[PDB]
Amino acid sequence: KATYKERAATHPSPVAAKLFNIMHEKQTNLCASLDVRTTKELLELVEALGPKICLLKTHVDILTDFSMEGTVKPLKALSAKYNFLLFEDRRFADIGNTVKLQYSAGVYRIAEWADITNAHGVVGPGIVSGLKQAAEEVTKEPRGLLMLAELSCKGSLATGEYTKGTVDIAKSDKDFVIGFIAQRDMGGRDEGYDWLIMTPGVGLDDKGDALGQQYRTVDDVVSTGSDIIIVGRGLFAKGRDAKVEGERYRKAGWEAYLRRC
């Protein structure tokens, strides 16, 4: 693949172009996933990691104290201050007006602040056009969608046929569907698509760390097509220093990226 810098210059999706530029300018392809229960801790960790990430994957629906003024406002301030995007990992799986409102309104009003979100292909292409319209209705800021073509959970029904169908759905709108949450390259280059491949389940194979050893290494995934590495507890759990781990994973991911290039 071309460099993040090059991809940013030609990408049809404004939100994707913005992300590639963030990655290029900050030398990072690290996505932090900080699944904590309080806004206070979330904000603390986000500020510590801000300089080292290009994206923050959130689950505002697991917070015990979510609010637009207390959570979203400060979060957006940090995203602007440190220059990284927000990705709400809601995994939408409905269609019609219901899904539009689940994305644009309700209590969370996701589309008003989340640069990126994701959806399952099972419901069909209507989820793409639906979410896109919902975004247009409540915000002028660039928005993007990641499809879930292959699931990693045990017993998932994401067969080869299912994956192909989801890829076909992604192909319906290159201005809005910017990529996939996946464990491998999904092609598409020959047909004019430049998909962001964001990969979770990534570690650095640290000695004595059983939990971390359940994941693939940063170099493994990046050398195999991953554009962004999604890292969670390895950045702040068990008494770790978020700034130190943020730099460690950022450096490792960037070095792996430079090597594949």
Q: Which residues contact a copy of itself by CB under 8 A?
A: 35, 59, 61-64, 66, 89, 91-98, 101-102, 105-108, 120-126, 151, 153-159, 161-162, 165-166, 169
Q: How far is the CB of 23 from a copy of itself (least distance, A)?
A: 26
The minimum distance between CB 108 and a copy of itself, in angstroms, equals 7
| 234/253 with CB nearer a copy of itself | 234
CB 92 within 8 A of CB 99: yes
Candidates 213, 252, 178, 187; CA nearest to 11 is 178
- CB of residue 251 to a copy of itself, shortest distance in Å: 28
Q: Which amino acid is located at 186 in the chain?
A: M
Residue 162 vs 193, nearer CB to a copy of itself: 162
Decide: helix, strand or coil at residue 30: strand
Q: How far is the CB of 225 from a copy of itself (least distance, A)?
A: 23
Q: Nearer to a copy of itself by C-beta: 232 or 253?
A: 232
The partner residues of 148 in beta bridges, in order of sequence, read 120
Of 153 and 210, CB closest to a copy of itself:
153
Question: CB of 102: closest distance to a copy of itself in angstroms?
Answer: 5
Burial class (CB in 10 A: 0-12, 13-18, 19+), 210: exposed
3-state helix, strand, coil in the chain (%, to 5): 50, 15, 35
How many angstroms separate the CA atoms of 90 and 92, rounded?
6
When the beta carbons of 35 and 47 are compared against a copy of itself, the nearer one is: 35
